Amino acid sequence: VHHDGFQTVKATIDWEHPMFKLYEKAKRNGKWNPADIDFSQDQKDFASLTSEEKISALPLVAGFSAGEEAVTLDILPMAHALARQGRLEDVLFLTTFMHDEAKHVEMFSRWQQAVGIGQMDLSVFHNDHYKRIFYEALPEAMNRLYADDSPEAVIRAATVYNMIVEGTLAESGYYTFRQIYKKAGLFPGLLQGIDYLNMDEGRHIQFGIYTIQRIVNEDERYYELFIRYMDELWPHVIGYVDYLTELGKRQQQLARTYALEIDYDLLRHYVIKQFNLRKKQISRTK
Amino acid sequence: VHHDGFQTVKATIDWEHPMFKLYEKAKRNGKWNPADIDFSQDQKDFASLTSEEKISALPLVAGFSAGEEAVTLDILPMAHALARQGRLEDVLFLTTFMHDEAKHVEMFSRWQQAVGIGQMDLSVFHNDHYKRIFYEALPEAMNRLYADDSPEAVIRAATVYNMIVEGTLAESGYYTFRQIYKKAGLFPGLLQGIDYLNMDEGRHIQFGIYTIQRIVNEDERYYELFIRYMDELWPHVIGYVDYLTELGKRQQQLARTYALEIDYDLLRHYVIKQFNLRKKQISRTK
Numbered sequence A, B: 001v002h003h004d005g006f007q008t009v010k011a012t013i014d015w016e017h018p019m020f021k022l023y024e025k026a027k028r029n030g031k032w033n034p035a036d037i038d039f040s041q042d043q044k045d046f047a048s049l050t051s052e053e054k055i056s057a058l059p060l061v062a063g064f065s066a067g068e069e070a071v072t073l074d075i076l077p078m079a080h081a082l083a084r085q086g087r088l089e090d091v092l093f094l095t096t097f098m099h100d101e102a103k104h105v106e107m108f109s110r111w112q113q114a115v116g117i118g119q120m121d122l123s124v125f126h127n128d129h130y131k132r133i134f135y136e137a138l139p140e141a142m143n144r145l146y147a148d149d150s151p152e153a154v155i156r157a158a159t160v161y162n163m164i165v166e167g168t169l170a171e172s173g174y175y176t177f178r179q180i181y182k183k184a185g186l187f188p189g190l191l192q193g194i195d196y197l198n199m200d201e202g203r204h205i206q207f208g209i210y211t212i213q214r215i216v217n218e219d220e221r222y223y224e225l226f227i228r229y230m231d232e233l234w235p236h237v238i239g240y241v242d243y244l245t246e247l248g249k250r251q252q253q254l255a256r257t258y259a260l261e262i263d264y265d266l267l268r269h270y271v272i273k274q275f276n277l278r279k280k281q282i283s284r285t286k
Ligand SMILES: CCCCCCCCCCCCCCCC(=O)O
Pocket: A060, A063, A064, A067, A068, A071, A101, A104, A165, A166, A169, A170, A172, A173, A176, A201, A204, A241, A244, A245, A264, A267, A268, A271
């Protein structure tokens, strides 16, 4: 359908819009390029691991590559919905969001190639709960926006994408990886990538908070919706966590070799903390 | 609809894909930030112009702000269509495309704000032909992709967007602006912006060429389609050119003051040359 007119012809960008400001910060702080990361030491590290230590790392990496690829593809309907509502500043920022995700996908894929597992099919580490979230719920919620951009639909999309996938699962995956491998002294290129990634993701979650809050500000009923959509996904969030946790207990060789007490009962609780923390960033009234 | 699996979990990015290579070049060469451009001299220049010299500049600027805003919004359906076909490398590159366009919109809008015409509604310089292209044909062709991603639909979208709007009209607008104001010594910030813009747009047109050619390579019948879609839009392309040309002849004050022989009959022919040149970049057989 036709453009009615154009905001930067009738007027200008809203320079004070929070999403314009977030866009400006993204440009400033979004310069990293995964093509510059030196993965040579990661190649050596991975090779020096035993076969059993080798796999220990793979489930988490499987979750991340899939996850970044899904969020790269699945933001597109949000950008469309907000474009069609005339939210130009949101769209500008979302170009940075989408390009960040592209770099995230690229980074993990480069790591896989470099350490020599690119030819391996890591889908084997996606259990039913992981699939429910990333192969199904996430694309369903986002694609819905093409035909239904109601407040309810937009809140649900931001909840699944920004608050659960990014704000709970991803945030926890950064923590877990850092905790295990930073302590080991392993995979410096990957950790550098994860650090840059974590910085970008700070902006993404702010967009999700802005989007959910601005809808909740129209009508408190929508607060209940937000809490409910969070709770509906929890079982799959924890059901994936348990499955990982449990894999990692069956191959604790990397833990004993590099002698780090991997407290799964501490990661499990970080995931719980993340989830509750995301709830608190939305208020019934603000 | 569900993700079947993920390319960077089953395998890796296709590092040799032409669009992956274009993506890598975009990251390297796409660092500029319109927020860094110094527009202070442009403010002085514009103020020092007479009222009649002032407007001389505005039609072209009106066409560009509208144009950048439209292409920012209207690439989204192409990214969707190619995502859904599993063309991950194209999608990665398209994140750079979309973010470039965001910077383009931002740049013109910053210039308008800086010289003090942000409050002016420049829609008055969009005639019927301009509207036919930018308010109508462009969004129609792109939005079609949501429900019809046939080769015919994808060729038509790339033709209107990449070959006509970018490759013919925009390319000619860069040339025209440089020709007039570079010679005058005016609007250095805007010209710097236009130079950065022109560099980005080199990549955009390569994507359009890749996309049209790869479809034409499946079936030569599609070459005829491409030439025909080009010709269908020409009347609106030249009909906008005439309207500009004609405005610029009625207010030739800026020409006489800054004493530059604005050869409209040379710009008109550049637009003709651009158009024919774009045709030549697609071969019936390649
Ligand atoms: C054993 C502790 C469990 C830790 C949880 C691990 C979660 C794996 C993370 C995969 C999600 C990646 C999604 C990307 C989101 C984004 O890029 O915006």
